[PDB]
Amino acid sequence: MKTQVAIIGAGPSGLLLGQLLHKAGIDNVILERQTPDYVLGRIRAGVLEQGMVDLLREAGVDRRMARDGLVHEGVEIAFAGQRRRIDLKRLSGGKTVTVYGQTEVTRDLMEAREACGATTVYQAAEVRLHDLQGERPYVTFERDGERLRLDCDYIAGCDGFHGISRQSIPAERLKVFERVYPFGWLGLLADTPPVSHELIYANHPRGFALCSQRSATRSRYYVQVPLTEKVEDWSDERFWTELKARLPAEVAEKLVTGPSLEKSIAPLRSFVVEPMQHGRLFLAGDAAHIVPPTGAKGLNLAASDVSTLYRLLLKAYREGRGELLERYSAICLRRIWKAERFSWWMTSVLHRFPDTDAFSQRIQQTELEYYLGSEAGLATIAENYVGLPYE
Amino acid sequence: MKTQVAIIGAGPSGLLLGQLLHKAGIDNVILERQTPDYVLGRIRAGVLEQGMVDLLREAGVDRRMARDGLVHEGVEIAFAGQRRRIDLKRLSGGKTVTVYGQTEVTRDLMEAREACGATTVYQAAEVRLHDLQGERPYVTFERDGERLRLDCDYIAGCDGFHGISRQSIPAERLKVFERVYPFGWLGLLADTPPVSHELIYANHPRGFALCSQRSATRSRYYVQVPLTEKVEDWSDERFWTELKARLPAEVAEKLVTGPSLEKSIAPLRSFVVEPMQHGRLFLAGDAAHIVPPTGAKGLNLAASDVSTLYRLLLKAYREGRGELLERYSAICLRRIWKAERFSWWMTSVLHRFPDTDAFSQRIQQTELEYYLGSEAGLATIAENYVGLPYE
Ligand SMILES: Cc1cc2nc3c(=O)[nH]c(=O)nc-3n(C[C@H](O)[C@H](O)[C@H](O)COP(=O)(O)OP(=O)(O)OC[C@H]3O[C@@H](n4cnc5c(N)ncnc54)[C@H](O)[C@@H]3O)c2cc1C
Ligand SMILES: Cc1cc2nc3c(=O)[nH]c(=O)nc-3n(C[C@H](O)[C@H](O)[C@H](O)COP(=O)(O)OP(=O)(O)OC[C@H]3O[C@@H](n4cnc5c(N)ncnc54)[C@H](O)[C@@H]3O)c2cc1C
Secondary structure: OEOOEEEEOOOHHHHHHHHHHHHOOOOEEEEOOOOHHHHHOOOOOOEEEHHHHHHHHHOOOOHHHHHHOEEEOEEEEEEOOEEEEEEHHHHOOOOOEEEOOHHHHHHHHHHHHHHHOOOEEOOOEEEEEEOOOOOOOEEEEEEOOEEEEEEOOEEEEOOOOOOOOHHHOOHHHOEEEEEEEEEEEEEEEEOOOOOOOOOEEEEOOOOOEEEEEEEOOEEEEEEEEOOOOOHHHOOHHHHHHHHHHHOOHHHHHHOOOOOEEEEEEEEEEEEEEEOOEEOOEEEOHHHOEEOOHHHOOHHHHHHHHHHHHHHHHHHHHHOOOHHHHHHHHHHHHHHHHHHHHHHHHHHHHHOOOOOOOHHHHHHHHHHHHHHHHOHHHHHHHHHHHHOOOOO | OEOOEEEEOOOHHHHHHHHHHHHOOOOEEEEOOOOHHHHHOOOOOOEEEHHHHHHHHHOOOOHHHHHHOEEEOEEEEEEOOEEEEEEHHHHOOOOOEEEOOHHHHHHHHHHHHHHHOOOEEOOOEEEEEEOOOOOOOEEEEEEOOEEEEEEOOEEEEOOOOOOOOHHHOOHHHOEEEEEEEEEEEEEEEEOOOOOOOOOEEEEOOOOOEEEEEEEOOEEEEEEEEOOOOOHHHOOHHHHHHHHHHHOOHHHHHHOOOOOEEEEEEEEEEEEEEEOOEEOOEEEOHHHOEEOOHHHOOHHHHHHHHHHHHHHHHHHHHHOOOHHHHHHHHHHHHHHHHHHHHHHHHHHHHHOOOOOOOHHHHHHHHHHHHHHHHOHHHHHHHHHHHHOOOOO
């Protein structure tokens, strides 16, 4: 087969890029290693920034989101003793965030694509990338036990952390920046009404807790755990007691509990690769960078990479301005690094780190007290949380 | 002898407290271990916050400062590539900082005291504190080889880091929080015109540099150095070349050099003791807490402790409200911890730390880029630099 742009991975990144390109008249084929329900089984993200909200609208996939997503104008931080609200809307100059599940976003994009009849190959096994620096790169994959070749002009690597894209670039061409945190988040998806109309981030001596939601009758809760914990060790009951133990008493008392729909432990990491391209291959989303979940930025960054890639390819195709594609990595990395710093910061102030001396503990408290206390400090949080402008 | 308030240390803290109390009608005696010129030989501080400026006025010792100190409405940060100005005045809502040497402040206070004829004992050796928890505490000291006893109602420990005050409290009564940085600052006092009308903090790959001043024909420069360096190893020339190597080219080219008046290496440290009192003993300034020089806060914090102690003692003496003295430590520590966090932050973003991975380096850069870039971030710096409100 032959196409314009070949996309590796049928996650939100590949799907959204695919959608935007199709609608713009640029043919693209998506190659996914797994099945459509495997993809749809990932819970992940709950919070979208306005830019991603706008991109979905632009891909013409926002009906359901407009109906079903919840607009939030504030978030709360609870730290030893109190509960503080950050008014996002007023502090960011009128911006908000939207709660809409990653699974939901993914489902909407898969439907839109299916309708349009754009090509998607599920269970594409053994994807391999070839001739990245030539004029004519191609992708090989196996469909059954048949190896097919897809010819294209450009490859978008939208295959997440463990994809093949990043792996296909000469190791010597990339500079890696990684931070591994000594803790993960145990998440619990329950068909219970959320404890608050807004999110609650909690710094507690026993460790971080987060009260999030999916809808009015669907909640998502997380507690920080050591990397050595196995989820088979966390019954629903154990989860509920522990959560309750990390929250403000008035919050724990109002908490409606119930059986889990899903439970999983996610390890926290910081990761950036520079540059994010090679020849005719362009990395986007988790393939190029990972942020700890704390600042609700991963999917939001994939969206900014995708927005940048899409606009650059349009220009190349419709305007014959292929040279601007050289500017892809410079553009995305300005945004990445600022989102990674916010994410690191959020992570360092709300989590309980092992082997922390008295000083470092006290500074942790003071940062909270300072930032939650000053109009300037509050504003720093608010403008980062809502998302910084797209370039 | 007998007095009301005995003060240990004839540094800025003890002198200013002494001055404020004398003028208010509360007799006080100051006991200093060293001579008056030894004290006057310390260079130290260049930057005063408006609150300390106001306190000096209130002690009626501001003639010379009003004439000779320089009002600064901005500071600059130079980091890999650029030079950024923080407009303090506009970002803090109209506040500025004053450049007036610690030595100058000290000289003015010593003169004012001498004029007033309030008691000061220089070369008071072997000071010892007794009966802190009684109704009648006293101080013993040796004048020659004669041990005298001073009876008083209260003791103010204004004896700096190494004083006897802090040492006199049951170790078990205090909680210590300390951070030792792996670097010091080599300072150079030169009778040369400063390179800029405003301060320049520089983050350079070879390490931090600071361009400060004392007057229009008096400059103070510092470069970060390892703790193993001995100043005997830093000729003036060596200092000048190294400084020049850490600054923006346009700044290094305009630099007027000359022989040093003083050269000294100061190690950086973070230190707080909780509580800051015991019985009839009250700690103030460096006796209770140390901040790295980076945020220009040490002397400024001594001033806030002293302002708090003075107002509490007035109330106790003139209003018979001795109970409020219990609130001394609570009041001061709110301010200390916020100044210590700013000081730590400033220190972590401008200095070159050994064994720093690629990630941590990049985040260091991003913090600068973020904070120097956002109106909210700039404001956070500005309100902290000028000094947060006194409680
Ligand atoms: C606990 C948790 C909470 C989160 N919360 C949020 C939040 O609230 N807001 C937010 O912004 N972000 C959050 N994120 C981040 C967000 O979920 C991810 O950034 C997002 O999944 C990235 O999308 P992606 O399309 O780049 O990658 P992925 O979602 O990983 O999808 C990549 C696709 O490529 C496929 N693939 C992999 N290898 C190959 C191969 N060789 N060939 C073919 N296909 C392949 C995969 O099967 C997958 O379908 C969260 C993440 C976690 C873990
Ligand atoms: C390089 C450098 C730069 C600085 N820059 C600034 C700046 O720009 N702005 C700012 O705010 N701060 C800055 N500081 C901090 C500031 O200099 C100190 O915080 C200030 O000296 C504290 O005053 P103090 O009176 O508490 O103590 P000190 O100045 O230490 O004086 C204490 C006095 O007590 C005496 N003493 C000690 N032990 C005894 C004893 N047993 N008996 C009797 N007397 C005793 C000492 O001899 C001394 O005279 C800087 C410090 C350094 C090192």
